[PDB]
Ligand binder design. Structure first.
Ligand code: ADP
Ligand code: ADP
Ligand code: ADP
Ligand code: ADP
Ligand code: ADP
Ligand code: MG
Ligand code: MG
Ligand code: MG
Ligand code: MG
Ligand code: MG
Lengths: 367, 367, 367, 367, 367
């Protein structure tokens, strides 16, 4: 049987069969529960059902910053992924799961236990997202800036060797930019407070927000013109209108101090990840920055990333930012390649081998 | 045995057997007592007998604004409902009673005690009228504007969940419009003063009154034409003739300030009930306004309700007012459906369980 | 023992035993005393003896307008009623006496005292004449126009409830029409002056007088033809001849201004009695006008009464005047029914109860 | 010129000049017409002339229950008010007329037309009687119980705002108590029947009748003593003597069921008028009951009114009944104040403005 | 001249002169307008005048949730604050205004424009309420839980640095607890509906309501004893009696789900505000919770707040809740300190500087 590839991100579940070139099931990775008692019935809703029904539900994300915080809701979301969205018996297919680097070891151990004991999967693996995202680009060398809903991380790879000491990780990604857009929308007098209202602010961010190429020149232009200012229609048909908020939101990727986060931005953390590498590989990394995940989808993000890294880099270096179309799925496409390589079929952790060695056996290639 | 469904409204008793699609007994819910001593004998008359005999009687309504104010007259009206109008032993049939939301808890408790101890009913329930009225329409989602003789209330329901915080209630309905029509009839020189004369003014209201689509354009037209002006023949064969009074009466549903009532009208209280709901359900509520009860029967009431809510609503929303024929009975038809559902037979409060838990057990699904 | 029923009217005593359908004793209710001394002996004559002997007597009526004005003559007339005309021991039979409404309370009290202390009657009652007259018709609803020798009164009754506030009473009846016929006979040159001559004018009225259907068309016809003109033979065999006097007399029932009486006529007082009633009963009263007593016996009185009330009534109403044959006795026939009802035997005022409670006990159902 | 103030009540015309503190002309408001033809001449008499001459006249009141029922007799009574009793050219003085609340609109319209077109008055107003009666007391807040010959009405006013929804009106006042005293006088054997005899019964009521503080204790005392029993001398010098009739008459203000009137009495209608008001003003109304008009003049009426309202009121409230001396004129004194206020001269409806706007302009402050 | 300090809260205006230790003017911040037309005059009433007169008025609050929704009513309330309650020329005194955090920027801009252009104030500032409330306590470090009529917000401050990212704001405060107490009073059969009746429910809440230390043990005790049950006398002297309603009301601060509000309660939002802070300051915040504003005045609120935060906190931490007497004014007392500091006189926005820089200049220290 062909393998399942389940990217299982913190803000979308992306799942499908290895060798397909887009995921079959892509759904919100939310569990919702009724706020109000029924008078007229399903206790909880998962994914797109909890989006369609979201006004009456509190929405929980069981994954935050790539760490599974509620396990019973994650077992619901996996159960729906296999039985309802893929419509597959999971005990017949090896499943390539996926994780961020530098997660707690217990997160991978308890995930592996749930796969072998609840779902009875025959064989399993857990890849690092930014390794897979490099397979999707075809490259063997590059520094992969992957930024999802939960985590941003740089993994530098050179000719197929990882550099574990150079892996950087930011707990700043799409959800922290939703939580910040809600605060700067509050300055126009738009108040969003419910978990179900944050799912509206997310669609605002996904439609209206872009990256300013020169932040303080856009701040001047929005302070002098309403050409930057656009409108958006709520599910109620009320119309909100937002201005410099359109680029002040993604700017928080480059100035995390906006959210009170003491950190380098994604430019300085990418340059620092490059600078922790040996001088000889550094030129090959500069020419192969690979962007992936949804938070790299903002209009003009690569165009500014190139000009910030060019400003940090020594001026002889060619800086190139490889941000392909469909970089939103490149972690899943990379896993869909990997799971179908003949060289990889050696690496599946088999059920027998997990019954033998226990949860020790799961970190054999782990960061 | 099949259940009894007793809508037991403040201005009509509607009662029958579950699974029938119209009530058997529909009678005025009045107790009358002789004003004059007999010289020529029944101490009190109930319902249609107190209408036929009404000239010699003072008529009391034992229910006002959905609250049972005289219990001995309510025990008379129930006794006649069971033994004379349905001709049924009540101790053999479970009875679905009915109530407005936000009534005093003691009203339901003392009603339940009278059913279990006087009439010895085997099992009982008390539904909210606007839940039932949604079952009658078949819909699982909508905002139900129910307006009887005593109470107007909006109950919003979304996919079978109630939203208790959004339930609105107006103490303004058909009886307050009778009491106001008597005052504006007094301007033509028609004086109605007796309780038995108000039962004439009620039939005037039920026959001649309609809703003006543009109130101040009808007020101009009645100020310039006698095409709006109609006549009506009293029980004495005297002829009265009424003009802008025909629409100034129901207008008090939309401008309660006419009766010195500080309130939103039924349009603004329906829109406010919609606006207390989460933005996601709001579009589904706008398309499913359900009208019910007798005070929604005026010609053109839905046609104006649609155009007032369209004026408050944001202009992208489809506004639809589902006002079916027989909406005068839809509370009873809803209860006649509910009482016959297999899923509902779990919910009957049994006599044994009331002897066990006391009047605590009666509010388990209550607003 | 069976009860005595004594109608004891102001111009005839009608008396008999309950359950008979005509009175046994019907006699003039007159006491006469010799005008001239005897030379050739009874001091006073009562009833038919004072009619046979009337030329030598002054005739007194002890009742005027239903009020007993001379009590010693009323005790004579009762004594003759019991001992000579019925030939009954009064102390063995309960006696249903009778009265007009709105009489002085003392009239009923002193009548009751005379029955309990002179005649020693065991039990007694005093009914209102127009209640009894409705029992005679069998009806439970109607407005009873009773017109005797002394009083005209309307009592409206609806389904066995009296309406005390709507009871009307006219001090205009058969004796005032005798006194007016004597004045308009004086215009033909016939002078009647003695009390014994008024008993001739009464028989003229009872034989020749009728009700004109259109008074001023009969006045024209009598002014142009002697077809309306009839003759009558006195006890002396002298012949008098009377013309428009035949209908100008009863017309005084409809235009009391002829006798200088400021009043509505019997049509307008019947319509006014109907109009003091609640609108709901009014239609049932219009269809059930019941005529009774001797002054309703004129030819064509119901035929004009119907056409005057039809002229006052609103044109949709059915007006019907129930004037049966034997309406001259219907007060007595009603009392003869009432006294024989089992439900009524509760109501006799017993001698013991009068000795206990005094003359307070006599007005328990009184107008 | 100073204004005329014409209270124009249903049982007295009270008229005078604004700024005087008692009316000049106070006369019966009666038109009388000869019952009998002249043989020895004025066709009709008005006011005090129709009282002095009343034995030969039928007396009509052109106003009944505050509604002008005969307009030609009302134009006679106004003509005599201006030309004979005030001796004034009406076309030189603005006239403050007066009305009850809740009268037919046509009554005020036809009154205004008669003033502008027959009498040619320059400017006119029509005040509500119970507003004026509050100006007479000086108070800005209170509930005014005004009871005349035709109407009783409560108008609650709080700090100079009327509460139209709380205005109560009873068609029960001094004339209905004359018509009831004639019926209970008939129980002593005194029969009053002529319109001119009712003007005797009125003076009996005005002299002998009082309010019992505890009705059934006075009924017991009159049933046991002749200390409550007084005598009165007719215009014929005949002496009548009346007992519990002295207080059973005014008691009909508190138990209207005595006249077959289904209603609250003046205590319960005053308390109900207070209870239709918002809770915050209610304490200020309880302390400021203002009595006015002639039917409040009975000895002890305020003393019982205070003790009935104290019995209905919640026991913490101070109840005070402000019944001043000269409350018989306080409607006219209030109008005499109002007409002389500078702030009021804005409000006169001018002849020019009535020719412009028609009878629409007359209800600008109307109930 | 000394500065004015105007706290200008959503439910009270508190105003005075800097350096005084209690405000001079404290008044309701209400504008009321007559519901009824005058017949006997001020178009609108402000503050304590609209409380004294409230029965006849609709009351509007121009501030809701700290946002000024009606500007013309806010200009009335400021005009009365300066000219009538303080009796001061505002153009001679710099005025420290005040605001909640995270308000719309336009609210502060339009407030500043009204001060500089209508009232012509020479210099102005707008402080954050929870900064001021810390100055009142004297502390330089603490987390300030301020809860007024409109907003609850936590502002954590450490040694005089704010932590903008940790500022939490709840749209749940005293007015939402009045609106909820009206709904749970409706369960005893007490219906409060008018805006003027909500001002009665507010005084019920302020007198009878307290915080249960163990909510479900008080719910059991009130379900078993009437020792928790107290009575209160309306302005009408009617007596209402309320039981578990006394603590179910304030419990909505801790379980907002009672009002259908998806939120943490004030305990969990205070703990979450502490947890968004860096670990080193967290111990210093736990020992310095500062309570302020009126909704913290309930008996026992600090005693439960301490025991909920102790339950969330890690057990080694000292938790202390600094809830001083007069915490109801501590925002104003803090502003009265701040306005008198010499170091602060640098910070006044001068009129000249506002004419120069425009409404940009107003957010220089803003959240
Ligand atoms: N086109 C877009 N523009 C901006 N942001 C986006 C876009 N698509 C997704 N995002 C944001 O990125 C996150 C989803 O990224 P994704 O890579 O799907 O996450 P995951 O790795 O959890 O699947 C969300 O925060 C979403 O708001
Ligand atoms: N066809 C009609 N048109 C207008 N009003 C009506 C009509 N039918 C009933 N009503 C009014 O509505 C009330 C009766 O409504 P209903 O729904 O039967 O009340 P309940 O819920 O008490 O049974 C009465 O006030 C009646 O006057
Ligand atoms: N057939 C008749 N036609 C006209 N008048 C009659 C007739 N019979 C009796 N009356 C008159 O009516 C009165 C008697 O009526 P009646 O009902 O017998 O009186 P009472 O009620 O006193 O018995 C007398 O005035 C008599 O003249
Ligand atoms: N002193 C009095 N005692 C009792 N009743 C009186 C007195 N004065 C007048 N009335 C009665 O009140 C009515 C007159 O009241 P008034 O206020 O003058 O009426 P109007 O408002 O029509 O002028 C009449 O019915 C009269 O009988
Ligand atoms: N002693 C008290 N007990 C309970 N609640 C109170 C008390 N005093 C005021 N409140 C409530 O708190 C709010 C007023 O708080 P306050 O701090 O004065 O508000 P603002 O910040 O708007 O001035 C009102 O809702 C009032 O009902
Ligand atoms: Mg991902
Ligand atoms: Mg109903
Ligand atoms: Mg008779
Ligand atoms: Mg008057
Ligand atoms: Mg505040």
């Amino acid at each position: 049987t062909t393998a399942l590839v389940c990217d299982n991100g913190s803000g979308l579940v992306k799942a499908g069969f290895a060798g397909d070139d887009a995921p079959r099931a892509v759904f919100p990775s939310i569990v919702g529960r009724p706020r109000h008692q029924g008078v007229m019935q399903k206790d909880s809703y998962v994914g797109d059902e909890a989006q369609s029904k979201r006004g009456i539900l509190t929405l929980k994300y069981p994954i935050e910053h790539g760490i599974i915080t509620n396990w019973d809701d994650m077992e619901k979301i996996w159960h729906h992924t296999f039985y309802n969205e893929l419509r597959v018996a999971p005990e017949e297919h090896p499943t390539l799961l996926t994780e961020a680097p530098l997660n707690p070891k217990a997160n991978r151990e308890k995930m592996t236990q749930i796969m072998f004991e609840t779902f009875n999967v025959p064989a399993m693996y857990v890849a690092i997202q930014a390794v897979l995202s490099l397979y999707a680009s075809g490259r063997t060398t590059g520094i992969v800036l992957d930024s999802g809903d939960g985590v941003t991380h740089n993994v530098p790879i050179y000719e197929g060797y990882a550099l574990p000491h150079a892996i950087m990780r930011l707990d700043l990604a799409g959800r922290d930019l939703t939580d910040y857009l809600m605060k700067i929308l509050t300055e126009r007098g738009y108040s969003f407070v419910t978990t179900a209202e944050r799912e509206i602010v997310r669609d605002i961010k996904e439609k209206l927000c872009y990256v300013a190429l020169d932040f303080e020149n856009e701040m001047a232009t929005a302070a002098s013109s309403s050409s930057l200012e656009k409108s958006y229609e709520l599910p109620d048909g009320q119309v909100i209108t937002i201005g410099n908020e359109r680029f002040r939101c993604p700017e928080t990727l480059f100035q995390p101090s906006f959210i009170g986060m003491e950190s380098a931005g994604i430019h300085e953390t990418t340059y620092n990840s490059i600078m922790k590498c040996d001088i000889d590989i550094r030129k090959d990394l500069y020419a192969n920055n690979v962007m992936s995940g949804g938070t790299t989808m903002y209009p003009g993000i690569a165009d500014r990333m190139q000009k910030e890294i060019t400003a940090l880099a020594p001026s002889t270096m060619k800086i190139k930012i490889i941000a392909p179309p469909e970089r939103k799925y490149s972690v899943w496409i990379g896993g869909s390649i990997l799971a179908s390589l003949s060289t990889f079929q050696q690496m599946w952790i088999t059920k027998q081998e997990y019954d033998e060695a226990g949860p020790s056996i799961v970190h054999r290639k782990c960061f």
